[PDB]
Amino acid sequence: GKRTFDLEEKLHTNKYNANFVTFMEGKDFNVEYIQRGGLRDPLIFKNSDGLGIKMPDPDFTVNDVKMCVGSRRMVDVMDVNTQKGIEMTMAQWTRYYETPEEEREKLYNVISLEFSHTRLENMVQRPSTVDFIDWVDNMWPRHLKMQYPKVQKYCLMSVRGCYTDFHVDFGGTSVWYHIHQGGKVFWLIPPTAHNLELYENWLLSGSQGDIFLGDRVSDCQRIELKQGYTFVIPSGWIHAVYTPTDTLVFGGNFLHSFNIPMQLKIYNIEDRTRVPNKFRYPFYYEMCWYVLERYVYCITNRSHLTKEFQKESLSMDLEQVHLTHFELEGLRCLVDKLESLPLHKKCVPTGIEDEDALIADVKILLEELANSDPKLALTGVPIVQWP
Numbered sequence: 001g002k003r004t005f006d007l008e009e010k011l012h013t014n015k016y017n018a019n020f021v022t023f024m025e026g027k028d029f030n031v032e033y034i035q036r037g038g039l040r041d042p043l044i045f046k047n048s049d050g051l052g053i054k055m056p057d058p059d060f061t062v063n064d065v066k067m068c069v070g071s072r073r074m075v076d077v078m079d080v081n082t083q084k085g086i087e088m089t090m091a092q093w094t095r096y097y098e099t100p101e102e103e104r105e106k107l108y109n110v111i112s113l114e115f116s117h118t119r120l121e122n123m124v125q126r127p128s129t130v131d132f133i134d135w136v137d138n139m140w141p142r143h144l145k146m147q148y149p150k151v152q153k154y155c156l157m158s159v160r161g162c163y164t165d166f167h168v169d170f171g172g173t174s175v176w177y178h179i180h181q182g183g184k185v186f187w188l189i190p191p192t193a194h195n196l197e198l199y200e201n202w203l204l205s206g207s208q209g210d211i212f213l214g215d216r217v218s219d220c221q222r223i224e225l226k227q228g229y230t231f232v233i234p235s236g237w238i239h240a241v242y243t244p245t246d247t248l249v250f251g252g253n254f255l256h257s258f259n260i261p262m263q264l265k266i267y268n269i270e271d272r273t274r275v276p277n278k279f280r281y282p283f284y285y286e287m288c289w290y291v292l293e294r295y296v297y298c299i300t301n302r303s304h305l306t307k308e309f310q311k312e313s314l315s316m317d318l319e320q321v322h323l324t325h326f327e328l329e330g331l332r333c334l335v336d337k338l339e340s341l342p343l344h345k346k347c348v349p350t351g352i353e354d355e356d357a358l359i360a361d362v363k364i365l366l367e368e369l370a371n372s373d374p375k376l377a378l379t380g381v382p383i384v385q386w387p
């Protein structure tokens with residue numbers, strides 16, 4: 001939007017004083033933290049230290065991006081004055097970023113450039129903790145990485161003045177954010193049963209653009225991200241973003257096993273809200289089956305993939321257990337969800353032999369481990385390791 005309500009007011013009134021964001025040191029961001037909290041709090045690290053992140057040399061610019069992914073390359077740009085207008089490439093767009101503000105004709109924003117394809121990849125690496133819990137590196141069969149939700153690394157490039165209205169990222173994913181150059185202002189809203197309600201009825205009634213959802217909730221936090229900060233958003237959070245100055249950001253969306261109920265909670269919103277099967281998370285329910293099969297294999301040492309995939313996994317490798325309540329309830333959710341899908345679209349992936357045997361093997365594993373000691377679960381390392 002930015003239509004009816006004064007965004008300018010929303011930016012300076014000092015009233016979105018909620019205290020949701022937790023400030024901490026990257027060293028403190030280990031897997032145990034996740035098992036202890038379930039990545040339920042948005043995090044803001046000021047020093048990239050301790051996070052195991054790697055980013056280009058600070059002077060890196062927009063074209064240094066468009067050189068790498070090269071010009072003539074089509075990019076999904078959109079005029080933040082309505083929607084969609086992806087009629088341009090890196091060539092045509094770096095020629096816009098450097099266009100002095102006043103001359104600047106339209107208002108553009110590029111929030112969806114996922115470069116993992118391009119060389120830039122081994123030039124930009126996310127915090128190692130995220131490499132431990134990510135459902136792609138650790139869940140999806142390795143030899144397949146389209147056929148692997150290529151939605152890990154992203155390059156955000158915004159121009160002073162753009163505003164992305166309130167939304168919850170796709171597939172109930174979490175997201176890490178590193179402002180390389182510039183700054184961003186966020187409006188954080190918690191995925192309270194109540195807020196998620198208001199949020200859906202808002203997506204239905206039209207997202208009016210006349211209502212600033214931030215004012216609709218009892219408490220909301222407007223935070224400011226500076227150059228150097230790393231920002232972690234947990235699944236489900238409803239946020240809105242505004243760019244005070246031309247910025248360059250590097251981040252990515254991931255799924256993990258400690259907040260499954262919320263992730264699914266969001267898919268169903270995306271379902272009821274008839275979201276276009278375009279912006280849907282790639283192979284969602286298919287990733288789910290691999291999740292179960294990894295859990296049942298890492299714990300029961302009973303493989304449920306096919307012989308073929310089993311060989312592939314073994315070849316590549318050669319080149320009791322106490323769960324948190326988070327995973328236990330989460331597994332319970334994947335099981336009920338998958339079981340409630342009409343037979344035709346249960347989206348059983350390709351590497352899985354018998355599905356029902358799996359589900360049965362999980363209902364059994366979910367009852368045997370029903371009593372896990374929260375203390376003992378805190379192993380410091382995810383049980384699903386070695387994709």
Ligand SMILES: [Fe+2]
Pocket residue numbers: 167168169239
């Ligand atoms: Fe977002």
